[PDB]
């Protein structure tokens, strides 16, 4: 019961830092270039390790030079990679990321390689006893629902002391994913998902979507410079203002920084109000830096 497991993607982010977003059909020179290990669940692992939490990553990878870079990076951060679902078919996903240096906007052109996703069968092979918290990045929802039902079954057969806490992230406005609201102790819904469902604020989104979550669950919604909100079974809307840096230079992975910091803070026994504030704190620090070094 010592690790935080993050289930989701690992993508190679080929970053270009620009002073202005390029206008279509133009040729701009970038300020700098870097490779960064990406993917939501993968980014959350980086943050958890920097926060001082033992963590594990579970996701699909295909042997090759890109996976070698990603594995070395994960290992350099002390992220346990023993749960990786190695694939014989597909290439490693990669994306071209344009980071605007004047406002931190990040634009991602993802190349999804048909790498088969982590299956309920792959998850069934995992001994859950070493995990205190399991975070699932919403992707192949029907297959992830089965993984979540397995954690519930495990929890039924354990005393309250040994129960594995569960969190779910619904970040893409894909209908398949909306069934994941009914699973997990903590549900993270993105601003992009909330806006697609017709909500114009975090408070509105929480009130509107709370009926979709499991009994006793906490629904969390971060809203960029507007900070973040959370709503629990007691019906009290919780809010935290953002901690924006004086100069916002990179928001790539700011959402993942928030998620990991909220999870970390809750796994440490802190209240929802303290976890919300801490998430905004670390996410805000991240936005004033390139990458993840120096967030703590």
């Amino acid at each position: 019961g010592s690790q935080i497991l993050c289930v989701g993607l690992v993508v190679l982010d080929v970053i270009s830092l620009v002073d202005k977003y390029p206008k279509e059909d133009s040729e701009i020179r970038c300020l700098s270039q870097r490779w960064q290990r990406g993917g939501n669940a993968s980014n959350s692992c980086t943050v958890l390790s920097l926060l001082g939490a033992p963590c594990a990553f579970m996701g699909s990878m295909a042997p090759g030079h890109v996976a070698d870079f990603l594995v070395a990076d994960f290992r350099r951060r002390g992220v346990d990679v023993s749960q990786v679902a190695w694939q014989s078919k597909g290439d490693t996903p990669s994306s071209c990321c344009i980071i605007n240096n004047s406002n931190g906007n990040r634009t991602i052109v993802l190349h999804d390689t048909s790498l088969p996703d982590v299956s309920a069968t792959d998850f069934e092979k995992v001994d859950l006893t070493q995990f205190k918290w399991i975070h699932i990045e919403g992707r192949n929802a029907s297959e992830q629902v089965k993984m979540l039902q397995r954690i519930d079954a495990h929890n039924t057969r354990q005393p309250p002391e040994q129960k594995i806490r569960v969190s779910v992230e619904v970040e893409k406005p894909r209908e398949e994913l909306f069934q994941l609201f009914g699973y997990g102790d903590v549900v993270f819904v993105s601003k992009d998902v909330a806006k697609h469902l017709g909500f114009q604020s975090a408070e509105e989104a929480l009130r509107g979507l709370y009926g979709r979550v499991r009994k006793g669950a906490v629904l969390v919604c971060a809203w960029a410079e507007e900070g973040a909100d959370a709503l629990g079974p007691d019906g009290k809307l919780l809010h935290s203002d953002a901690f924006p840096p004086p100069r916002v230079v990179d928001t790539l992975g700011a959402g993942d920084t928030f998620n990991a910091s909220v999870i970390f803070s809750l796994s440490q026994g802190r209240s929802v109000q303290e976890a919300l504030r801490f998430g905004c704190q670390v996410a805000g620090k991240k936005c004033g830096l390139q990458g993840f070094d120096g967030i703590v």
Copy 2:
């Protein structure tokens, strides 16, 4: 390994990692989109010419700057896949190996480019000074850091002054970017390639106007070459006779990216084989024309 004396064609210039993403529509800033297809390609003018020289059957070498890392590893493996000798690469302790991001909009064909940064130092005259030239029969320089490259060209002239005519290294220069720094390179080389883009920027409206207008800038006995896309290519040498070749357009134009580099490498190859300027012009148009109907460099020969 052992490279026989006077056997290679050396190409000095840029190697870049081109990341090309094909999209339905141009992404709006701060959005996360999925591309239709994505490819990692080795680019750069001198780099592209090396590929073509290898496919033509010429032993060839590339000289350019690279920084140790995963990008350089991809580029080196891609050079090797194309039989290019990479032993002359100027490995750098500072800077990033060039990488570019191209976004191609599938609904209108628009190409948006986020060019490589300027962090990596270019090949210097002192890096070039360390090269034993005896293994090269031809040295092609892609015009970049002109003041440094002029010194490299002066070193080849000095080498040649002490050589019998049969052991003289032939030299070619490409002025492809409309940068004033580069215009001093016209006065160097046996063969000078000037691009249509450079010629137009200098106010020339045809390969003929460009050659007649710029010939006064080349050294005694040099051949000035100018390809003009579908209008074919022209050359002008010391005899004052303007030479022309019509283009050999493919039945359907597929990919013109690196067609200029294909022309340059084919002209060089043909001249290094002892063919005349007229024959080299025609051969350059033929290979460049074949390339335009092909994706990449496979099947150009």
